[PDB]
Amino acid sequence: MVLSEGEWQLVLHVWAKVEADVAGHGQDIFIRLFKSHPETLEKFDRFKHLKTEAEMKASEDLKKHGVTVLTALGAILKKKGHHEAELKPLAQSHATKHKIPIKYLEFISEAIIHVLHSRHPGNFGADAQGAMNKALELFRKDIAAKYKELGYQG
Numbered sequence: 001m002v003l004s005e006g007e008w009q010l011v012l013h014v015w016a017k018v019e020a021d022v023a024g025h026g027q028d029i030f031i032r033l034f035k036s037h038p039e040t041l042e043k044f045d046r047f048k049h050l051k052t053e054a055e056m057k058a059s060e061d062l063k064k065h066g067v068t069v070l071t072a073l074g075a076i077l078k079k080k081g082h083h084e085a086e087l088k089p090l091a092q093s094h095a096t097k098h099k100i101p102i103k104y105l106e107f108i109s110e111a112i113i114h115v116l117h118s119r120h121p122g123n124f125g126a127d128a129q130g131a132m133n134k135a136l137e138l139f140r141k142d143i144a145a146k147y148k149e150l151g152y153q154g
């Protein structure tokens with residue numbers, strides 16, 4: 001797939017707002033993901049003991065990880081599809097160290113869309129959401145192709 005520049009502009013315009021508060025957005029995304037798909041929490045030895053939303057919100061460790069995650073994803077979206085270099089290390093650790101199925105990337109994609117719709121309705125109408133969904137779908141398709149080359153595809 002290929003996004004048009006107008007699609008990238010929609011993406012990067014809302015990302016600009018997320019970047020005003022990366023830690024807050026990191027936190028809402030992971031809490032949405034862990035609440036909606038509790039099974040994903042199991043992949044994180046580091047966070048598995050967190051039992052409630054209160055504990056998640058109070059964890060500085062989870063807040064620190066949500067900033068790492070959004071920083072990495074932000075660097076990929078800013079490349080506007082030319083993200084082959086950034087993807088390599090991330091595909092390698094996620095297929096071989098952490099063993100994250102593509103279906104869990106779909107779950108966090110759904111969490112990111114849910115939080116942007118909630119916090120930024122003004123910059124996240126239907127066309128901007130269709131653009132972010134194509135950006136994340138591109139990300140997922142390119143990561144799945146690397147997974148296959150690395151010997152994991154799943």
Ligand code: HEM
Pocket residue numbers: 040041043044045046068069070072073089090093094098100104105108
């Ligand atoms: C937008 C998608 C994602 C991005 C950009 C992202 C990025 C990152 C980054 C940059 C790191 C640290 C370096 C590394 O190990 O590669 C990391 C670690 C990790 N990722 Fe992801 N990730 C994403 C999705 C997920 C999902 C959905 C899961 C599990 C459901 C996951 C599980 C983990 C784990 C288990 C670690 C190691 C945590 C620790 O013990 O320090 N990742 N991720």
